[PDB]
Amino acid sequence: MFENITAAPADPILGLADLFRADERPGKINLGIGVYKDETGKTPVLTSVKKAEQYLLENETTKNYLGIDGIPEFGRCTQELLFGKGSALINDKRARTAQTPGGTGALRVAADFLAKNTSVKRVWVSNPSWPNHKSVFNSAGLEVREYAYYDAENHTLDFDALINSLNEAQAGDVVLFHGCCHNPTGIDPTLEQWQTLAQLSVEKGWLPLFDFAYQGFARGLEEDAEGLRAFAAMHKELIVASSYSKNFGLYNERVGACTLVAADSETVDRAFSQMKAAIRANYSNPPAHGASVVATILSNDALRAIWEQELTDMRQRIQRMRQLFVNTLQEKGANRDFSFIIKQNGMFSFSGLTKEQVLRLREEFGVYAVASGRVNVAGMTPDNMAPLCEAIVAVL
Amino acid sequence: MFENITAAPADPILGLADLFRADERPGKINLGIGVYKDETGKTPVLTSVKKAEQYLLENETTKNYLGIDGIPEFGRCTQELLFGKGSALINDKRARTAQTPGGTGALRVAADFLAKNTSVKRVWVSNPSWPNHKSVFNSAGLEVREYAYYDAENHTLDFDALINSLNEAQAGDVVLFHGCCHNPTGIDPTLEQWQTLAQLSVEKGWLPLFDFAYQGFARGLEEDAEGLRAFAAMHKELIVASSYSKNFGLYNERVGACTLVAADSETVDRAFSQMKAAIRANYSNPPAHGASVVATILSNDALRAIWEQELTDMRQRIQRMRQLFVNTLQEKGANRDFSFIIKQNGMFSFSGLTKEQVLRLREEFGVYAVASGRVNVAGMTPDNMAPLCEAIVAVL
Numbered sequence: 001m002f003e004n005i006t007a008a009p010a011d012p013i014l015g016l017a018d019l020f021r022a023d024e025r026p027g028k029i030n031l032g033i034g035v036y037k038d039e040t041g042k043t044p045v046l047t048s049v050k051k052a053e054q055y056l057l058e059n060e061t062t063k064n065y066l067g068i069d070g071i072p073e074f075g076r077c078t079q080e081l082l083f084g085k086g087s088a089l090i091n092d093k094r095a096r097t098a099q100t101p102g103g104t105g106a107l108r109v110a111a112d113f114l115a116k117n118t119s120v121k122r123v124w125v126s127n128p129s130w131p132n133h134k135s136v137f138n139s140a141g142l143e144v145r146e147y148a149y150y151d152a153e154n155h156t157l158d159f160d161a162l163i164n165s166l167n168e169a170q171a172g173d174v175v176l177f178h179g180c181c182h183n184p185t186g187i188d189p190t191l192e193q194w195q196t197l198a199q200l201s202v203e204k205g206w207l208p209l210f211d212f213a214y215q216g217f218a219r220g221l222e223e224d225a226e227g228l229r230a231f232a233a234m235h236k237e238l239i240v241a242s243s244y245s246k247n248f249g250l251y252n253e254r255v256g257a258c259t260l261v262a263a264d265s266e267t268v269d270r271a272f273s274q275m276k277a278a279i280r281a282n283y284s285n286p287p288a289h290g291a292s293v294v295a296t297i298l299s300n301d302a303l304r305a306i307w308e309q310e311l312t313d314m315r316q317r318i319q320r321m322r323q324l325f326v327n328t329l330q331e332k333g334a335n336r337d338f339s340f341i342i343k344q345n346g347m348f349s350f351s352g353l354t355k356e357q358v359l360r361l362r363e364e365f366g367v368y369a370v371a372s373g374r375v376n377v378a379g380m381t382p383d384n385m386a387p388l389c390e391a392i393v394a395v396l
Numbered sequence: 397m398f399e400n401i402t403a404a405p406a407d408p409i410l411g412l413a414d415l416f417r418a419d420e421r422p423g424k425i426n427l428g429i430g431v432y433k434d435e436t437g438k439t440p441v442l443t444s445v446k447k448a449e450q451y452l453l454e455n456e457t458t459k460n461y462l463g464i465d466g467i468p469e470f471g472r473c474t475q476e477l478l479f480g481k482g483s484a485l486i487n488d489k490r491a492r493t494a495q496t497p498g499g500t501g502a503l504r505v506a507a508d509f510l511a512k513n514t515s516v517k518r519v520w521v522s523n524p525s526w527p528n529h530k531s532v533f534n535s536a537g538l539e540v541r542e543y544a545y546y547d548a549e550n551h552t553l554d555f556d557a558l559i560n561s562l563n564e565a566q567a568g569d570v571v572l573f574h575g576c577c578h579n580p581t582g583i584d585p586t587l588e589q590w591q592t593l594a595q596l597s598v599e600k601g602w603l604p605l606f607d608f609a610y611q612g613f614a615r616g617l618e619e620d621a622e623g624l625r626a627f628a629a630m631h632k633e634l635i636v637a638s639s640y641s642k643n644f645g646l647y648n649e650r651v652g653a654c655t656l657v658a659a660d661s662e663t664v665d666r667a668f669s670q671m672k673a674a675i676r677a678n679y680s681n682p683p684a685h686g687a688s689v690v691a692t693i694l695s696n697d698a699l700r701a702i703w704e705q706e707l708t709d710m711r712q713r714i715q716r717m718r719q720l721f722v723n724t725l726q727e728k729g730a731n732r733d734f735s736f737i738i739k740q741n742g743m744f745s746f747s748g749l750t751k752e753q754v755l756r757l758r759e760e761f762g763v764y765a766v767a768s769g770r771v772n773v774a775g776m777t778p779d780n781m782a783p784l785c786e787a788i789v790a791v792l
């Protein structure tokens with residue numbers, strides 16, 4: 001049965017990491033990383049998370065299964081983060097949340113739910129996006145179409161091209177939006193652009209699917225949800241796939257949520273029953289440890305305060321590296337405009353370098369970016385910035 | 397998009413539990429439970445697990461993502477449990493293991509892998525089985541057909557009927573076997589029956605899929621794997637979906653494994669690359685906490701010894717309740733043969749009562765079994781056995 005199976009395409013993540021490990025040069029620098037790193041080049045466990053884990057160790061008395069949709073407090077805290085305390089969506093009980101194994105698990109649960117219970121056949125994804133978006137939706141039997149997004153000339157949002165692209169989307173298609181910190185570009189709509197998109201989505205009959213993996217990494221928790229909330233104010237229906245991997249540094253514990261919104265409580269409860277069926281037939285019920293940490297933190301004034309400051313620390317270090325990168329490139333004689341790096345939000349940006357320049361950076365200088373261009377600015381430090389920028393100037 | 401969605405069928409688990417909670421009678425008794433309970437009616441965290449969790453809290457320095465297939469030590473320990481230390485399957489590197497979110501996650505990863513990368517269209521499942529088997533395989537687009545298993549007259553394995561049923565299976569169909577402690581009957585093949593089935597499977601060209609959720613609950617870790625190992629000795633290819641939910645009491649941490657076996661290392665590695673693709677497009681990578689606990693325990697002599705004794709304690713309490721149940725029914729005047737309960741293995745058995753007797757037990761006596769018949773003998777205690785058995789005799 002297995003003798004003729006075609007191998008999957010080589011894992012480019014595995015992968016780039018393997019090449020970097022094998023590189024016997026210093027100072028080699030890895031900007032192809034997929035997680036936050038601090039100024040020491042580590043991805044520590046957050047202190048708020050360690051404190052929560054100690055509390056769980058002391059107080060847990062069973063590992064009995066969670067419900068299919070997970071910890072109720074986790075759901076409530078998630079909806080407040082998404083929509084705001086006192087939101088009409090919450091007051092009117094229009095939203096149901098399932099705790100999922102990561103943001104990815106939430107995307108797949110959303111996809112399976114839509115494929116099996118609606119007429120949805122197609123999901124529109126930005127060009128570019130996280131490569132796993134297409135894999136997730138295709139796995140559920142859904143077609144993926146791309147819409148224009150990145151202006152490679154100006155390093156900005158090509159808003160006219162975006163709108164023109166999405167004119168080809170039919171009523172009943174899904175359109176995927178990154179809530180904040182677009183991956184890989186770091187280019188987000190302005191609030192007014194979000195409002196324009198919200199109105200257009202209503203007029204054209206799109207179902208919005210928000211991927212919200214970086215709440216708190218652009219400007220702040222509430223500000224980063226402005227776009228989502230502009231959509232929520234305008235739509236009867238939407239889905240949010242959110243992740244706590246990055247903003248709690250809980251990557252490997254698989255902590256995310258799929259939030260379903262419908263016109264009223266009866267409708268969302270009925271629809272959610274089928275979302276729970278899609279979960280049951282996948283991984284049955286979700287992993288408790290990571291989500292319990294998140295619920296424990298978000299529902300406690302003291303732990304939440306520590307966590308919010310740790311997240312602010314990450315956000316600020318990322319912005320400091322963006323600024324230091326631009327300043328240092330100028331000082332090392334790049335002699336061209338990289339100011340777009342300061343405007344972009346989150347860990348990831350396109351550098352504006354070509355695929356051949358990226359290859360040259362790897363081969364000749366031991367500087368590693370994702371082949372297709374994504375650089376993680378959290379791989380930058382004050383200590384490695386000068387050689388990093390000297391290498392970049394050398395391939396310009 | 398959601399206004400016309402048909403509700404999922406009412407959750408019978410949720411469900412029965414809700415009815416039991418609302419029941420204001422004592423002594424109400426819940427035998428419809430889906431987990432182990434000790435003599436106090438609790439499902440504690442195992443001491444070995446608590447000790448491991450303390451070690452992890454003290455020594456973990458990152459939550460950085462695991463690989464798609466999870467913790468390597470977890471995989472190695474899993475293969476030794478399945479196949480035996482020094483197995484040719486292990487020596488010849490014919491097996492690859494992915495850590496998954498529970499046994500259910502392993503079943504779904506197996507199903508998605510088969511649906512997308514092989515000609516498999518059909519999975520044969522015992523009548524009866526765990527109801528979620530059909531849901532999982534159907535979710536991946538696979539047909540489920542039933543094979544005869546339970547002899548309702550003699551409360552035994554209807555082996556002739558089983559063989560006759562499976563004659564309708566075509567070469568290239570998957571056949572699902574429960575490794576030990578068949579759910580819901582507790583009826584397992586003898587070693588000689590397993591050997592007969594192994595030979596037949598080779599001759600007919602079936603792909604064996606083992607669901608191995610109860611290793612250690614029938615006779616012991618090695619004895620409970622005899623059946624699987626008889627198949628492994630005879631087949632080039634098979635898949636094992638195993639769970640640590642029950643034998644580590646780690647239900648809500650979602651700890652299982654999907655083990656792929658092929659004729660040689662090149663073939664299993666190639667095939668496994670597509671199993672990893674199926675995982676990536678589902679939940680990306682697996683939850684660390686539960687699996688790290690399992691790897692920590694299995695790879696440490698001291699913790700493993702404590703865990704093995706805790707599992708022995710569970711196995712023995714289950715067997716003691718099976719014996720006490722049969723003895724007490726006789727003493728309360730049942731006046732019919734329940735000796736099959738002693739022969740059956742694990743938490744679950746059919747009582748031999750009808751669906752109407754089960755309903756009557758719930759309504760008139762506050763004794764709760766799964767409507768279709770499954771009783772969990774770990775819901776029995778010395779303290780509740782007499783009233784339990786008095787109620788049963790009253791509906792005979």
Ligand SMILES: *[C@H](C[C@@H](N)CCC(=O)O)c1c(COP(=O)(O)O)cnc(C)c1O
Binds near residue numbers: 130
């Ligand atoms: C996270 C991007 C990560 N995953 C980069 C490493 C990798 O690709 O493996 C991300 C997710 C996934 O979040 P979870 O880890 O919680 O599943 C989903 N959407 C976006 C836009 C991301 O950036």
Ligand SMILES: *[C@H](C[C@@H](N)CCC(=O)O)c1c(COP(=O)(O)O)cnc(C)c1O
Binds near residue numbers: 409430497
């Ligand atoms: C476990 C049976 C449990 N799940 C009964 C409660 C319920 O149905 O929800 C079981 C599994 C699932 O194991 P995981 O919890 O690790 O996913 C798989 N196969 C069999 C035969 C089981 O009994």
